[model samples]
Target: ALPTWWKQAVFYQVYPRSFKDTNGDGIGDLNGIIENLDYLKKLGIDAIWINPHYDSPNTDNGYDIRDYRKIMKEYGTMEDFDRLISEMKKRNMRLMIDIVINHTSDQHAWFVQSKSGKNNPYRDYYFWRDGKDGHAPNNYPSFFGGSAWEKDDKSGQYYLHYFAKQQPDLNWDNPKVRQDLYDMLRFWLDKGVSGLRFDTVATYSKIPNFPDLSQQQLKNFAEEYTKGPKIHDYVNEMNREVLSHYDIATAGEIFGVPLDKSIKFFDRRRNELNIAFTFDLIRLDRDADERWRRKDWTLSQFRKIVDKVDQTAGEYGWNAFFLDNHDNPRAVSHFGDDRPQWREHAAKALATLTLTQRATPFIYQGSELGMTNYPFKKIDDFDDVEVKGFWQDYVETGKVKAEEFLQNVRQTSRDNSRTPFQWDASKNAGFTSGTPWLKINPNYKEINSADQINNPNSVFNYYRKLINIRHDIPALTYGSYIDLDPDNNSVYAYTRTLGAEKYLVVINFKEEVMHYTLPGDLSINKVITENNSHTIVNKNDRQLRLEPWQSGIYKLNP
Candidate 1:
């Protein structure tokens, strides 16, 4: 494997709409980010991954790109974009922009032109298929809900949509479509982005047959759509035509792909991506079929998945360690206990795990503040189109009970993370001067970043120190990882080693005191870092008692 800058850096993902709003129009914009880059840099992140800010109808929060060339009006213009890049350069910080190419907003010129007439030149830009009899199309279910195919009245045919109807799947089989997307990528690279975060890159290609999901396939909905025959071909072509031209970091969001296959995207020799960002870890607490349906997770399950994720990417390629993103619930809320008594310890434990792992840890906005999930009670409280669609399709139809589904949504709604960032205790969490596009967390007064930024004991400061440890400790970034106690139900024990030096990291996953014995002859030479309380006692020479969610880094005596 070759050396890359990203492999050693910590990335902070800023969901633009929720980060901050400077315009006071209730939406976060480019200036909002520009004003906050210094704040992030101060927080110790090396780079920023801005979620989509391109012109969009926002059907899926800018994932549905309407115009690849222009910046979204809500975000600002090309000039503001350039200023952001220039400012980051001044701080020696890198910038990574989200490139969502699997689908385009229906309002996009290509989709619009395609829908106009069957003979339209841009008709092949997207999939247009004949319906079977009275039915619209194949039995493929949308990742959001309902059939993945949406009928076009003009052509009396159906267009494929892995997500919402506003976002139609681009036909990768077409040469022109491929050619145009490459050009679109070059457009941003030309603007001097240090990296590219590909959104749902796994959905780029689909089986040409578009067959109905088999009875057995009903067990998993999006698996068939993700394992398309030409995914490798399409990705490699893109890398060859565009990515290879620049020395840039790339992270491909590959969900549910088999290890052997998913690894190919991150395989150093394949020249595909710097990081294979998978969702196995983040989706641990959710049902596979109905993501809204919550699942209880144990530390054992988390340990198994984390190890698999580590080896899958860490072996042949690189890893992007993230438990939080715009699409999922807050990490502290999901994996760690989010109760008032345990939030700080759980957040710090998760942060230790994120930084100590042999991957580029991505800290989502507000994650540093130990952000918890929102209290979503009813269907009307949901703002995400995906959640709203599910409410209509499942809850309204009685496939999922109303009150129970509401509870499910509360546990797993993307809106839980999408709520305007809690910056301070001010009105609307200081995220907006006017009504926020999304409601602010009511706990902002207690959980806002302003309160934690200066406090050494606060979660934000703990993250700051962890980032520095990750930056200063070469072994933490470039080390061999081993899960020392994979079966331990309460505490996660792991080690990252480099040649002569080895460091051990242990964290309590439960909210009660637990005892963990150091693995092998790895006696703790000294405690390097700790969270919750630095009170480490030698329960014995080899065993240590851990406080509820307490975490520590120890330099092992050889």
Candidate 2:
């Protein structure tokens, strides 16, 4: 029997800017994405995911929308977007549009007119408060680095923004604002999008009494991840009145909620949200302003995170598992796959590790290519706003030299992932006609899409095979997850069973050669990839040899 609709889905995200460029305008367009629909279908991807293409002012890279109806001139026309969706449907692919309802570009006409004066009818559509004496409202800081509250010179009132100052937070407390958001969502869904990926949805609702921080320990974290009292209320309302219709698949970018509570926010019973993307692992690197510190994340730590998620989802609701997304650096690089000593092993192990989990698995665009993070020799090569802001702040403070700060910033920006997509071993990686908006990594000649798509043993093809296995087997998606050996720091092993079908998955996390005893009486159906290095050894009596980064999944007796 086949799995449920969503469970069987394989989603591939497309970053418009780095995707194909149609007119050679140094930017990707709707026509370019439409042209690539066949490419996605050929990639074994079931769903087509598009980043924000709405009308925008490019302040926060189109996270700030100026208008909801029109297409931004930088991308293409609205007709092109319509044509792209039509083409996507022809390929039997589901489409998802990015819905950013949390805030609007400050340049939006509503915000522009609203900030003109207090009496403006549109003024109440956003979070605004009178400044005390001369200072801005509260000490709340924006995600862009400084105070979240920005003062309007004309109105003499400070408005709150959870992200960039130009992105003023919307007032969901206002019935009119909520209704407007729902209407815009309907407009896109009606246009044939399968679902929406909601951005910063937790910030829509603020407590009636937005209190100042009292617990000093949490104050710093709270400023960046504040899901006030009314957040759930708004989420539930949006679910009941808007998202729950016509079997729509919805996911949210949420913060603050713990693993247990976070799952409930998406429980099918609660009807609050269909799925929620948690950042516990992503935030692991953002620890206490210590960028200089190396990540001491042991295999035990990785196991704990996986086990905790398994338990939480096993208890309350399903989970969404991902190592890299559009905002983060390449997972292969972040998870210690950069060096030749561990690259292939770590890549395969990561696959063996994530695919055995109970939740759905999402593969980023180039993840299947075993793409490593961009290794820039110069800091001038990075291009993320947050990185530049942090670098500038570091330099101005005179605490760090420009070169040192730039080096740290390069290691941690969207630019690391924003590098041009490598399609073939060509100049510019065949991602652009001229210069790309961002720099292309130098490794494209060695790792690229065109080269791997045809090679059965390539990483891209390996991922394709992995997805097919998951699609063909029912237990891989719905079976219970049991951590076989929690104490074994060098080996991550587990089993998934569906009726008479049982499979054992194991990976070697350590660099040194390791030996392991097979768990039970099982026949090895196949060795998918042995060590990624050309080395191989056949074994008997349930014993196996794992070279550094090698992983094995065997078909076992029930």
Candidate 3:
């Protein structure tokens, strides 16, 4: 069976660079995380998942890892990380750190040796091939909008990179490479971490023949590279080699797994991973090119994706539920209304919608206070390498005008979610004492943790209550989910049923009031919680009224 602690735990994600800065270095460090232990304890999170904080060039932020054993210089030292684990243990909280094994920075020692000469033993550590007909080896495109292969002038060979050229994909076929990765995993497990979050875990393997893709297959390249022939073998081997030795939680950021095949990775019997974070629901708003270019999304489209995941993983295996993360825009600003009047209501409603599901819920940093997206007006304000590279490729080539590209960047850039956390109404949003690496959102003064921590009706407190409710009630975590209104355009309603207990969750996703009718056989026992003033009002057995952007949870009885 899966670990019981993680299955019922409340997870909080921390992007270290923007969480807080204690040394006045304009960058958040591990010491800052140490200073905020009490705050997290008060918020009632059982586990914390921190993004990559290893030694890196920071080209792709911290994802371009240089050394897995050491901490980033600007962040802190190895000693600070040990103290963080100790502090979390004192509070009875578990810690999970990101493991980025898919690629390494070009400055790594192995990559340097591999590029020096073809006869070097390290040359087999990465993919290097002679150019095909004076061009790239294949028609694959990097996620940042360029040919996936980057030519090395000195060695006269091209190396494959799924992302920025600074991050070259590793050749996982090498036995030495696999052994080194497994050793690194043991090193951290020995240091007392409770779990690991695998980054881009599915993209480690590639097709044997680097053949060209047809026009239709180009759109499916991400899926093709993700579900390679040897991926299952690699994961199972790792489980047998290192993961089975200790009792720990493991989550994989799996991208291209379809609904029919998702169970292979997370089924309890598989022993591969405890949970898989899929992107099917998040991709509904993207365009054909995988860019978030649209403004409107329907409720039916969102419901269909949720229903598929619930049926697929809820029965056979465990799944993860999340709306926003370090790589996407704020949930309220993107999926719900972010207008000044409706922001709080929509955010509270979304919190209720996710926390009541059967899957484990992940809450991004600062989302409890209803944070919005960044107001980036110019290309210079962005710091994401992927966004900047795409802008240069499309805008410079005249494929898209500068103004039009800026509009899309404002809506889709990862920097929108990387802004400093809003802790108080003070300068720089109380994130740092010096200049921040990135600009803080101007709305921080109105929406901050300080203002909501003590207020009983604030969004932060609402999230705290939701966490407590889900923790105390077993039905919310391991119950049967049934959609009550699958085709509704404005109201998204569902019910969770366990042996003798049932909960009715109703959320109104519009600015106008909506009317919902209860089943004749069901009777309202009491209200659990709500975002609006009146938790329950003018309710009969047949019909119920919902205020604009209101979300309600009610107990049901026969």
Candidate 4:
């Protein structure tokens, strides 16, 4: 196993469509990103991870691939993507593009040939199933709310899609399909892509039997197949065929597998993956009843889960850390207890909370500015295809009311984070000259980069400061960690040590001030503090005033 550059590297994700739109086509393109290199470089991100930029029908917002080798015309040409990657490299920055191999748009050439009758050589490239009892097989539901199986009237068979039916899952069981994906991966890595963000990679592993649900009750029988046994086989193949040849960074979007099992993919020896993202913490607030809308979460419970996850990731391999991503809503609006007044504390709290952890921190776009939810008072204000499908499904099922579901969409929809980047207080947040693809968050005028980039007291500056303190300090990045209290309710405290250097970090999750007793062995270095509220009382102790959602890291001067 060889050491990879990404082991200690920090990445920043850019949703190209919302990042910048140079063309007046109402969506972001490659040239837009090239223009922002100076800004991203200034932010100190070692790499830029952009979402799917390949040719697509925009069915799944670029996740539905139409061609693996070409850039989407809407997002610019192949030349634009090439230029963007080249520019980033010139700045000593890496470009990691999305690899959405889980599925392809129904209009994809391979799927088109596959669905045009069973005999097409490409026919076996997708999970094509015979219609059962005059309907699609098994009652599995899509992530967007409807049945995961869609009947192709042309072929008279069903294609599987965990998401919308328009996007059919690829047949990883087929060697040709695997080869096609490998070729696609090689195309990017050879073109100087730093690595791949494997989209739904675990979904590639389908159980051998594809058994029908025993009880005939569940909508999705694929649950048992997500982290199936053959997952590593596919990953090792990916490593041997593609990643092994290139010094690429890899992170997988995996779920359901135990932490130990999942981390094995990141083991360099296994040639599986570099790191992986799990939803255990993000989905913790959801209903334990399995309905997904529950938001009940105590600070203590959340901390426990994260602490365990941290230890798990630490023991096995490196973990990819984040509070928000393309799949979830903004953290400040959904989980931030620091709000109303001094909202900067929301960003500061999250910064200090996660940056001090063992995993490599991933900062989502706009999270650094303490950005909150995009308030869509009406369902019509939303734009994401996933949200729209769910809204229609809710209407058809009558399982939930429209107003209630609208609130859910507002809080949890990908649209919340998909809102255009607020680069300035201009008419369109400086994202575009034409009508923007999605509405900008109303707070953009005040939260825009133009304002925060100049204000040292702004949340944006606080985030950069936090990143600098973590990245520039080796102890903070690679030290051993131990949770101070496993049951603390509104506080998360941990100690990180490397040789003689030790630092303790404390984060107050509540909205009110709190006090903490300093340990006797650790001398508080009040000289270095993020917040002015932390004051040293005794020579080796301190009485801390933690404002609503305030956090601090104190070094042990031994």
Candidate 5:
């Protein structure tokens, strides 16, 4: 189902801009990551996925690449990348780079050449079509703004862009478009990088004719999306020509690609991706299927999504286990209580559940420090291009009032996680000597890596302990997983069994104390790990009491 090396590994994603700034420019760079590799090593991560550092215009936070072959000067030079590779090899660490082939920067040579005129050979490399009338081609909506079609004055044609007009989607219909991309894939693998985490990979294919959809169809696009025709064919061809020749582990972001369709991406027999980054949990807090509106999610509902995904794909395929990432709010703030007194307890508890699951554990930067979402003051305080685009789309057009739009984005903006990382309480969270490009979290004084690095019972230490346990115990990765209490809303419990080693994990998501009764056949042989030191394990082995925001992994007497 999955390869041995990758399944046994834990990945940490470093959002380059927010990670660390060594140049005192208030922005992170490759040298900063090279400097912090030892810190990640101490965190016990087996591999790392650094966000896209390719030359970009910053239209979509590095996802819009101006050049696929060169590193962004703001990030650093290629020499730093080579050193990053060399230092990683010395530590036996693997690097998984982000690839955004679904689209490229408007300034990219291909797009620039294609936009020059319709007669150029590169014109077909990107999707460009004539206007249906005096207006644009279709009523389809882009993720960030009004319409998916943007008019190019020179070519007198409308080009398709899924996000900003600066990000033009490539035309996968052409064999020439796919060929150069395959060549681009070889560039990074040849440089000794491990593999890729394709950004919006499933979105590479589009519907034939780019037909119009009803309003309901557009609204429901948030959850269920057609990956479109020839989706599998494109991925399979890439695998057959390039990926198969390289010994690399591939993962894809299948946002909106339904579970049934997504499973085939990791079936191994399909020659597609090795892992699928599903977003059912990511969309749980959104109202209905729309991301602009926010709503609270029940534990039973959360359990159902988790169970549904694991049941569908856990048997024959694998998936990435993560709650926090660059694109969404922090896990503790989103899933657990982030109050002053409960943040650490909740953070540790969430970490336990993610790491002990039967899949590769992926940790986002600052998640180990229990970083909560940013306290946004106004819309201007946010720097995310997507957020700004959304504001222009809705507020400027009077679709929603200015204040209404601001309030909605406060809890759901990408700028929450893009704030400069808090390394210490010093100036700029010690992330930079100069003013930060983005504002640092004001609570950095109380919550930072400097405070947790030495504290034994801190969230950082708890993450380290869990990571080590995951690496040491094969059951955490290759175990037979069984959900013990499928209906309990407050307390989630499960068991991971492999040979003589069996583990029981219980987590109380609520603030109130909860009671969990062990099965008649199973007894706690040893307590492997516990989030809070106040875990009140009843000596009766059969009776277990968990405090607020508590979680524990116990070795069962098999």
Candidate 6:
């Protein structure tokens, strides 16, 4: 069975470098996070899922792990990490670190050994293939674009990297590699981390042949590497060797796994992972044919994604529900309104929607303050490798115009969420004492934590209240979900029902007023919370009116 603590837990995702900064370094360190424990506690953070803080090249913003056991130099030493853990212990907060096992930085000793010579003992630690027709072994495109294979002049072979060339994919076919990773997992768990967020875990198992993608299979090429032949075996082995022995939670970032296959990863009998985060909802905005291009998403598409998760994983196993993370734009900016008039309401609406679902909810950093996308006017304003790589591929090649592409970048760039956290109205949004590694959002003066934390009606407090409601009411987490208006584009309504308790959640997704007709069987006992003014008429005891972008939660009469 899954751990009960996680079912009722609220996760706060922190991108450490952008979270806070101390020591006048302009970089967020472990000490900076330690200093904000009080703020997180006040926000009712049950568990904090920190992005990569391990020693790295930062080629992919710390996702490229050079050393697993050591702390990043900029973030501080292992001692600082220990203090952060000790501090979290005082507040009874759980810590979840990013476990990046899909690949390692090219500077890692294993990779160095693997590429040292053709007959090197570690040559099999990563995927390396000889040239085919004086080019790459296959035509598979890297997630960052171009060929997935990077040539090594000295070795006269190419190494496979699903992401940047600096991060070479690990070969799980090697028993030594698996054992090394399992030992590292034990080391961190032994240090008392409460849980782990496995990074790109589904991509660990690649097809041995590394075949080329055909014209018809370009969109599904990821399936060749994601959840491959030995994925289940490797996960089972990891569970037996390390995970099953701990009482901690484990979640995997499953890529390319559809709803039909999601249950296999987190089912109780599987013992693979405690939960899995699927990209079904997040990918709704992606263009249907291109997958990478952005397109306006409809409410029905969003509903279908959520309905799939709610019915499939919600009933069979476990899932992590989130709108924004380190990889995507802020929720309010991407899916909801971030304009001055609707920002707070939209933020609350999204909070109500995700927190009430029958899955663990995760809030990315700065989202509590209703943070929006960064005001990036040009490609140079972004720092994410993924964003920069796309610019190189599409813009430099003249396939996309600079102005037109920037519009899409503003909506879809990962850099949108990586900007410095908005703490207050001070310079650099008080995120650092010196210059930040990346630019801060210009609107931080009006939209910041200081402004929201003091106001009970602000988005930050709304999040706190929503989180408290979820924790106080068991029905929110364990109850069955029933969609009330699945076809309505302007309004979203749902009910959560337990044995003796029933809760109804309604949200107006549009700016115009919406008149909702309540079902005959349901009756509102009282309003639990609301984002804007709402009117419930008793004429027929069935009609209610919601103001623009209004959201409300109510208790239902038995």
| Among all candidates shown, the one with the greatest lDDT | 1
- Per-residue alpha-carbon lDDT of candidate 3 for residues 139-231, written as tens digits (9 for 90 to 100): 888877689899999899999998889999989999898998999899999998998998888888888888887798677667767767888
Question: For model 1, which pairs clash?
Answer: none
Model 2, residue 66: distance off in Å is 0.8
Taking all chains together, each candidate's TM-score versus the true structure is 0.98, 0.93, 0.97, 0.95, 0.97, 0.97
lDDT string, candidate 6, 1-558, tens digits = 243998779999999999999877888999989999999999988899999999998999889999999999999999999999999999999999999999999999999999998799999999999989999988877877778899999889999999999989999999999999999998899999999998888888888687777776676666656747888888888999899898899899987776687788888788899877888898788753344479877787788778878888755588788999989989999989999989888988999898898889999999999999988887778888887777777888998888988888788888889998999999889999898999888899999988988798888999999899999888988888888867878888889989879988888888999988788678778778888865653322455689998998888888
lDDT scores of the candidates, listed in order: 0.87, 0.73, 0.86, 0.77, 0.85, 0.87
* Candidate 6 wrongly placed segments (more than 4 Å): 1-3, 288-291, 536-541
- Model 4 RMSD in angstroms: 2.2
Q: Which scores greater on TM-score, model 4 or model 6?
A: 6
- When 3 and 4 are scored with lDDT, the better candidate is 3
Model 2 TM: 0.93
Native-to-model Cα distance after best TM-score fit, residue 164 in candidate 6, in Å: 0.5
RMSD of each: 1.4, 2.6, 1.5, 2.2, 1.6, 1.6
Native-referenced Cα lDDT, model 1: 0.87
lDDT of 4 at 307: 75
Model 4 bad stretches (over 4 Å):
1-4, 214-222, 258-260, 288-292, 532-539
Error of 5 at 476 (Å): 1.3
State model 4's lDDT: 0.77
Location of the lowest summed lDDT over 10 successive residues in candidate 5 = 219-228
Report the number of clashing residue pairs per model.
0, 3, 0, 1, 0, 0
Query: Which residue runs does candidate 2 get wrong by more than 4 Å?
Result: 1-3, 214-219, 222-225, 288-294, 340-342, 377-379, 393-395, 399-404, 519-540
TM-score between model 6 and native:
0.97
The predicted structure with the larger lDDT, 2 or 4, is 4
> What is the C-alpha lDDT profile of model 5 across 1-558, one tens digit per residue?
334788888999999998998888889999889888898999898799999999998978798999999998789999888999999999999999998998999999999899999789899999888888778887777888778899888878999988788999998889999999999999898987886898887878888887677777777663323557788899999999999999899998887777777787888878888877888877677755345767767887887777777776766678788988999888898888999989999999899989987778899999999999998988889988888777877788888888877777888887888888899999889999887999999999989999998899889999999999988888888887788766778998888888899898888998888777777688788888887647555433876788888889888876
Ranking by lDDT: 1, 6, 3, 5, 4, 2
